[PDB]
Amino acid sequence: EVRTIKVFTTVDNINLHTQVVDMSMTYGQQFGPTYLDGADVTKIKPHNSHEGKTFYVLPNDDTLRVEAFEYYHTTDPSFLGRYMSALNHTKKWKYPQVNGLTSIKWADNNCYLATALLTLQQIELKFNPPALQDAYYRARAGEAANFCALILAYCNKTVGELGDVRETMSYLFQHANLDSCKRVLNVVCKTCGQQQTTLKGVEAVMYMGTLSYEQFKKGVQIPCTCGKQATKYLVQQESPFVMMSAPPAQYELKHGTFTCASEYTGNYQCGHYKHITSKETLYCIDGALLTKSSEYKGPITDVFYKENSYTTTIK
């Protein structure tokens, strides 16, 4: 007897594709790699309980290729497997509301993700892939498992791998509309003179070398190709926020002078991130953990600042 059930395949979990599957063959024999809300059913034969459910598959016809690219903005053939493999884990994570923000209870070295997710909720940023727009909306309401799985997939990180917040923010910014952001810098060398540079997009909102936005406006010392020390300072800035990053160092965070910041304790390959947010006082969010203080000092590695338009007075 040949038995069949009706199921739906998908790449974006919105547009469904009707399939009648033979229950005597695995999903893999019929669709290739097949996933049920994260679980790999490629080697499973259809159950009766599967009738009417949706399965993710690879984009193995033109319709699915277009649906997949329009939704995810990637054509990495390995994305689906990485996304599903992460989602199996992030579905089991907990997403507490901490001081009104969606956080992540610690698991699987996910501190860098919690700090990034907390940061996102405090800066103005619109994602370009509908997949991130949709999942981020749900993350803000507290159901962040799909968003975290997507971030892991876009960043090419596996669950358990310790990521870097700055790197993660860079990936997130690459998938956001920052076309309006503009930065103008001046570099002054006593030997070589002045050199002005204009940066746009992601490069206009990220800096590596100093944590202080004020010091960046005043001027920072950097090597010149002639061997001497040159001074670089901020000429103009058009963006809704800036990110200042630096190798972890003892740094003093003052209430009201910044938006939020990343603290990193440990060494290059192994450590722990914490998040500091400046509200009515200074709150330190460490996954599900929350403490408060009037002053904060610790190994800070990223600081976020609000911005709209800045123009130097340095002549």
Q: Which residues are catalytic?
A: 111, 272, 286
Q: Which is nearer to Cl ion, 80 or 253 (CB)?
A: 253
Of the residues 27, 30, 42, 79, which one makes contact with ligand HBA according to CB under 6 A: 79
* Distant-in-sequence, close-in-space partners of 214: CB < 8 Å, separation ≥ 6: none
- Residues paired with 206 in a beta bridge: 243
- Residue 249 phi/psi, 5-degree rounding, is -150, 150
Q: Which is nearer to Zn ion, 88 or 231 (CB)?
A: 231
State the Cα torsion 170-172-176-181 to the nearest 10°. Answer: -30
Say whether 284 counts as a known binding-site residue: no
Residue 65 makes contact with Cl ion by CB under 5 A: no
Of the residues 152, 202, 211, 230, which one makes contact with Cl ion according to CB under 5 A: 202
* Distant-in-sequence, close-in-space partners of 109: CB < 8 Å, separation ≥ 6: 160, 161, 162, 163
Q: Are 60 and 11 in contact (CB under 8 A)?
A: no
Say whether 189 counts as a known binding-site residue: yes
Residue 57 makes contact with ligand HBA by CB under 6 A: yes
Q: Which is nearer to Cl ion, 127 or 207 (CB)?
A: 127
Site map 111..140 versus Cl ion, x via CB under 5 A:
---------------xxxx---x-------
Residue 166 makes contact with Cl ion by CB under 5 A: no
Site map 150..189 versus K ion, x via CB under 5 A:
-----------------------------x----------
Please give the full DSSP string across 119-157, using - where no structure is assigned. HHTTS---BSSHHHHHHHHHHHTT--HHHHHHHHHHTT-
Shortest distance, position 116 Cβ to K ion, whole Å: 17
Pairing of strands 54-57, 4-10: parallel
Of the residues 189, 205, 244, 303, which one makes contact with Zn ion according to CB under 5 A: 189
**Rounded to whole angstroms, how far apart are CA atoms 31 and 227?**
61
Of all residues in the shown chain, the one whose CB is closest to Cl ion is: 201
Question: How many alpha carbons fall within 13 Å on the CB side of residue 304?
Answer: 25
* Distant-in-sequence, close-in-space partners of 70: CB < 8 Å, separation ≥ 6: 12, 130
Residue 71 makes contact with Cl ion by CB under 5 A: no
- For binding to ligand HBA (CB under 6 A), which residues are involved? 11, 56-59, 68, 72, 74, 79-80, 83
- For binding to Zn ion (CB under 5 A), which residues are involved? 189, 191-192, 224, 226
